[PDB]
Amino acid sequence: DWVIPPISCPENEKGEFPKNLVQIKSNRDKETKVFYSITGQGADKPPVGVFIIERETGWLKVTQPLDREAIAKYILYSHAVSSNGEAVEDPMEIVITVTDQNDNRPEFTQEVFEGSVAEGAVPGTSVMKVSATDADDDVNTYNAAIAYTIVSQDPELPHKNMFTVNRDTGVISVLTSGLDRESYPTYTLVVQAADLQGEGLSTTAKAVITVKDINDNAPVFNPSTYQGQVPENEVNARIATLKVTDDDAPNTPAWKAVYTVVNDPDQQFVVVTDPTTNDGILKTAKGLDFEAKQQYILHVRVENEEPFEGSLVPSTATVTVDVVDVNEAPIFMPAERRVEVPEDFGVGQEITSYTAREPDTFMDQKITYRIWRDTANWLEINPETGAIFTRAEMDREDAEHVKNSTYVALIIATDDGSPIATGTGTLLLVLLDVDPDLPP
Amino acid sequence: DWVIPPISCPENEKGEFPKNLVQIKSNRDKETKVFYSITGQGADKPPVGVFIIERETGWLKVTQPLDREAIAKYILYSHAVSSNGEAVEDPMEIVITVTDQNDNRPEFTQEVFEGSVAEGAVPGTSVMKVSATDADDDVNTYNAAIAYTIVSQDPELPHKNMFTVNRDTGVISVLTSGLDRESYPTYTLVVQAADLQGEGLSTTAKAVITVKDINDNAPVFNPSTYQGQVPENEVNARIATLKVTDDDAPNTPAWKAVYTVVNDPDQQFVVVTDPTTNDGILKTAKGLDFEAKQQYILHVRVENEEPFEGSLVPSTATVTVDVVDVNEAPIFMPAERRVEVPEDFGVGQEITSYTAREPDTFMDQKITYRIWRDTANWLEINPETGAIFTRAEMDREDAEHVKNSTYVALIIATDDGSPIATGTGTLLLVLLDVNDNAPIPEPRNMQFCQRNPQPHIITILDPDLPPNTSPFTAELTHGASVNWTIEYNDAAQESLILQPRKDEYKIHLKLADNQNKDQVTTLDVHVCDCEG
Ligand SMILES: *[C@@H]1O[C@H](CO)[C@@H](O)[C@H](O)[C@@H]1O
Numbered sequence: 001d002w003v004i005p006p007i008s009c010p011e012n013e014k015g016e017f018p019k020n021l022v023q024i025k026s027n028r029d030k031e032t033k034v035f036y037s038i039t040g041q042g043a044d045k046p047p048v049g050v051f052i053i054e055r056e057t058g059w060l061k062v063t064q065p066l067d068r069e070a071i072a073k074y075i076l077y078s079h080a081v082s083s084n085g086e087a088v089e090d091p092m093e094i095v096i097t098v099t100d101q102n103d104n105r106p107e108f109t110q111e112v113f114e115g116s117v118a119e120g121a122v123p124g125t126s127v128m129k130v131s132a133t134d135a136d137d138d139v140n141t142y143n144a145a146i147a148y149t150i151v152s153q154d155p156e157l158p159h160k161n162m163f164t165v166n167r168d169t170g171v172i173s174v175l176t177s178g179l180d181r182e183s184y185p186t187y188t189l190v191v192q193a194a195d196l197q198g199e200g201l202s203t204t205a206k207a208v209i210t211v212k213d214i215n216d217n218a219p220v221f222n223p224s225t226y227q228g229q230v231p232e233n234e235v236n237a238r239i240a241t242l243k244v245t246d247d248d249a250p251n252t253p254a255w256k257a258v259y260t261v262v263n264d265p266d267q268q269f270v271v272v273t274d275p276t277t278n279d280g281i282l283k284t285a286k287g288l289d290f291e292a293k294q295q296y297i298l299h300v301r302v303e304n305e306e307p308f309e310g311s312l313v314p315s316t317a318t319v320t321v322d323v324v325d326v327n328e329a330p331i332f333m334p335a336e337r338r339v340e341v342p343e344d345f346g347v348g349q350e351i352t353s354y355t356a357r358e359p360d361t362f363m364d365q366k367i368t369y370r371i372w373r374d375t376a377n378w379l380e381i382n383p384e385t386g387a388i389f390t391r392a393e394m395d396r397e398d399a400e401h402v403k404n405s406t407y408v409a410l411i412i413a414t415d416d417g418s419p420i421a422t423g424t425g426t427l428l429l430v431l432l433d434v435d436p437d438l439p440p
Numbered sequence: 441d442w443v444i445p446p447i448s449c450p451e452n453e454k455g456e457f458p459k460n461l462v463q464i465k466s467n468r469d470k471e472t473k474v475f476y477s478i479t480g481q482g483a484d485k486p487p488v489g490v491f492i493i494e495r496e497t498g499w500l501k502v503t504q505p506l507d508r509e510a511i512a513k514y515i516l517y518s519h520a521v522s523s524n525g526e527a528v529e530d531p532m533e534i535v536i537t538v539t540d541q542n543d544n545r546p547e548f549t550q551e552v553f554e555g556s557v558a559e560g561a562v563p564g565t566s567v568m569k570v571s572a573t574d575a576d577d578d579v580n581t582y583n584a585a586i587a588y589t590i591v592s593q594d595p596e597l598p599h600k601n602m603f604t605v606n607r608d609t610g611v612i613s614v615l616t617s618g619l620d621r622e623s624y625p626t627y628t629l630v631v632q633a634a635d636l637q638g639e640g641l642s643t644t645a646k647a648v649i650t651v652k653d654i655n656d657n658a659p660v661f662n663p664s665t666y667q668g669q670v671p672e673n674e675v676n677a678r679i680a681t682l683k684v685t686d687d688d689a690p691n692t693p694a695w696k697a698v699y700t701v702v703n704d705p706d707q708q709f710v711v712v713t714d715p716t717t718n719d720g721i722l723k724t725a726k727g728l729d730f731e732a733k734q735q736y737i738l739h740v741r742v743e744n745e746e747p748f749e750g751s752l753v754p755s756t757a758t759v760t761v762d763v764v765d766v767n768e769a770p771i772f773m774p775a776e777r778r779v780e781v782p783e784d785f786g787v788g789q790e791i792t793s794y795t796a797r798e799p800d801t802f803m804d805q806k807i808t809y810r811i812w813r814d815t816a817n818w819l820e821i822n823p824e825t826g827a828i829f830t831r832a833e834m835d836r837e838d839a840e841h842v843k844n845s846t847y848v849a850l851i852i853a854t855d856d857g858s859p860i861a862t863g864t865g866t867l868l869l870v871l872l873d874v875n876d877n878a879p880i881p882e883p884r885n886m887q888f889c890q891r892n893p894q895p896h897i898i899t900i901l902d903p904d905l906p907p908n909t910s911p912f913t914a915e916l917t918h919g920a921s922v923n924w925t926i927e928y929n930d931a932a933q934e935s936l937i938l939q940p941r942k943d944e945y946k947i948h949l950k951l952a953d954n955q956n957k958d959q960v961t962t963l964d965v966h967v968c969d970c971e972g
Pocket residue numbers: 125126127128129171172
């Protein structure tokens with residue numbers, strides 16, 4: 001029927017007890033002596049005795065400072081009973097709503113939040129999420145209005161303001177540029193939650209950013225000037241091993257070295273990387289024939305399996321490479337000498353001067369012409385200038401030693417330098433007739 | 441039903457209006473939109489709009505500041521009506537009691553209170569009763585608790601404060617003593633009524649108490665000593681007028697004077713009171729006497745018509761009454777002198793000395809006797825010693841003016857005082873009978889018969905008194921026998937009977953008593969020829 005508006009008593013109302021709330025009355029209180037009582041939880045049921053009525057007057061009282069976190073609304077019930085025991089009124093519902101108070105400082109879901117970010121992080125980029133919770137009601141007051149701030153970064157370098165937390169989501173982001181893993185790879189932050197939109201109760205926690213690796217460090221030679229040498233006509237010959245220091249995380253693609261010869265037109269050099277140390281093993285891809293080039297002054301540059309991040313400004317070494325002239329065999333020119341000679345050729349006369357080229361350009365080398373393969377003893381080559389003279393009577397009809405009207409004999413031009421390199425040339429002595437004979 | 445307790449608002453609340461009293465709800469408020477309204481005296485009925493209710497919230501609130509003296513209780517009613525016009529609930533009586541505030545100074549039922557007290561009443565005695573009345577809440581506050589106090593008495597004497605008031609009764613009574621009708625006949629009081637038991641709002645009225653009269657003042661003789669002269673045998677003659685002064689209410693019994701002579705044993709003097717002047721005129725109730733008392737010195741006191749009040753010490757004055765001696769007529773001693781004297785008394789012989797006393801005792805009085813009345817002139821008196829000798833022959837049987845046995849003279853005794861005073865005695869001179877007379881026959885010219893005579897009585901006369909009269913004896917020396925016979929008819933000699941013995945003349949006849957003879961010559965009796 002007619003009732004009583006919901007009552008409000010502030011949480012933790014402190015002062016003297018007990019306090020009045022509102023008195024109730026039955027219009028039947030002059031019909032008979034009526035006796036009031038209140039029931040429900042908070043009254044007779046737990047928490048028993050927080051609220052009470054004066055049986056005589058019907059005054060409802062609260063006994064103690066309320067706590068809404070504990071219990072934010074009591075549902076009580078009043079009764080009117082005559083003195084002769086008959087219940088007079090159908091019980092009236094009485095609702096007490098305890099109102100809120102900033103009596104609950106905020107608190108982080110975690111003692112310590114931890115996250116990570118790229119070394120080369122784009123300011124305003126997002127790292128981490130920090131959170132906290134207040135126990136009053138944000139539905140009705142700013143007492144659960146949590147406002148995150150940051151109050152300390154360790155280390156406070158390069159700046160003191162590397163990151164920031166979104167005031168009212170808790171999301172931590174990159175504020176500035178300068179996160180170098182190579183420099184400060186972990187950042188410890190004390191993050192603060194405060195209720196009353198930061199104005200009220202402050203509770204602090206921790207958030208740790210390990211800034212991680214990013215190929216942001218070119219490999220470096222030491223020094224830029226190397227120096228060595230190769231047997232000129234050798235292949236797979238180590239020229240020199242060159243040293244570099246990638247500052248990035250070790251053993252990571254962003255660390256291991258890729259070398260490249262920039263000035264190698266002939267594809268005659270190869271520098272392979274030594275896994276364990278990523279040194280530059282400078283070899284030869286093709287045996288360097290000395291005479292054309294006495295020295296190679298070439299550069300070699302460094303990289304990483306992992307492509308460089310951003311601008312690329314790669315380091316370069318200079319290996320002033322020296323080849324050494326090795327004594328090679330001289331080359332009969334031509335190697336297949338064919339000449340026609342009348343079988344009736346004079347004994348002791350010159351046939352022809354068969355010669356050889358000198359490959360090693362020592363302006364100081366000589367050649368010795370001899371002959372071994374004289375099947376039938378007719379020839380005798382001048383040891384000095386390759387001159388050939390018959391020292392016996394030739395005959396084209398001379399069978400066996402004359403294959404097919406042609407007589408083959410092997411000549412030699414031995415060398416005069418380091419090792420004894422004996423060039424070999426061939427004379428085809430073609431004897432045409434001068435009955436076993438040939439027409440006419 | 442579950443009602444709402446009575447709300448109480450302290451009258452004349454000063455705050456920011458309007459002010460919320462309570463907030464009502466109909467539980468049906470959620471099954472339909474309900475609209476709250478109140479009605480009644482202060483709501484819709486005058487006073488109007490004193491109390492209001494917000495329709496959506498059902499907040500009771502007040503608009504004015506209430507006044508308890510005006511409206512002390514508000515009875516209101518709440519109404520719930522859905523947004524569809526259907527009255528959702530039953531009207532709820534809402535009762536509002538206005539609490540009180542001390543905001544009504546009391547006020548004396550009378551601008552001025554009259555009163556009366558008797559002169560010299562006892563300290564503690566009750567004179568009158570004043571009153572005031574407060575408009576505030578006497579059932580529940582001292583706001584109506586009055587304390588009567590006296591502010592000022594007029595005048596401030598004999599004492600600064602003659603009367604006190606019964607703090608909370610209004611009664612005014614005689615604090616101390618000295619209340620005099622004769623000094624200050626009325627007092628005026630400024631009495632006060634302050635509430636909160638006397639510490640609150642005061643207000644003030646007048647109280648006028650007249651001190652009344654009592655016979656507290658004795659009447660006093662203006663002059664203490666007096667004097668007066670009065671003649672000697674006059675009655676009620678002013679001798680003096682007694683002057684007295686009484687301070688009490690004029691023309692009241694507590695003022696009227698009453699005069700009493702102390703020296704009043706025989707009651708000779710009376711003193712009456714002049715209605716208006718109240719003076720004490722002194723008369724005499726009886727004729728004074730000079731020869732007895734020279735002069736009277738009497739005390740007369742004056743007390744008052746009504747009994748005095750208390751120490752009663754009456755005032756007396758002392759009047760000396762000089763009596764006036766007046767010449768009083770002399771007294772014969774006795775006034776009626778009787779003397780036996782014989783009829784024979786010689787001419788110049790002195791009968792007696794008849795003398796009067798002088799009543800006046802101033803020795804200048806000369807009593808001078810002169811004879812007043814004697815129709816026979818048998819008498820003569822000495823002007824000096826008042827002796828009365830005879831001057832002629834006296835007769836006991838001079839029947840003309842000796843009516844009885846006695847002759848009666850009148851003597852008077854004058855004097856020579858201021859006025860002339862005279863006394864009067866009467867000489868009762870009895871004359872003893874003396875036989876100077878002689879017997880005679882009654883019928884002198886008697887008459888007889890010549891033929892047959894009848895008998896004739898002859899009366900005998902004799903003026904004297906026995907024994908000079910009765911035993912009469914008669915004879916005839918001259919003749920008789922010649923036809924004469926006398927018999928004393930009566931056994932005792934009264935008279936006799938005479939008659940012829942045989943069948944004119946003059947007979948001589950002797951008579952006597954105690955031997956006093958007288959032959960009576962006249963017996964001229966004619967004898968004539970009759971039959972009888
Ligand atoms: C920053 O924002 C990113 C989204 O780009 C989240 O993954 C991270 O949890 C932090 O809130």
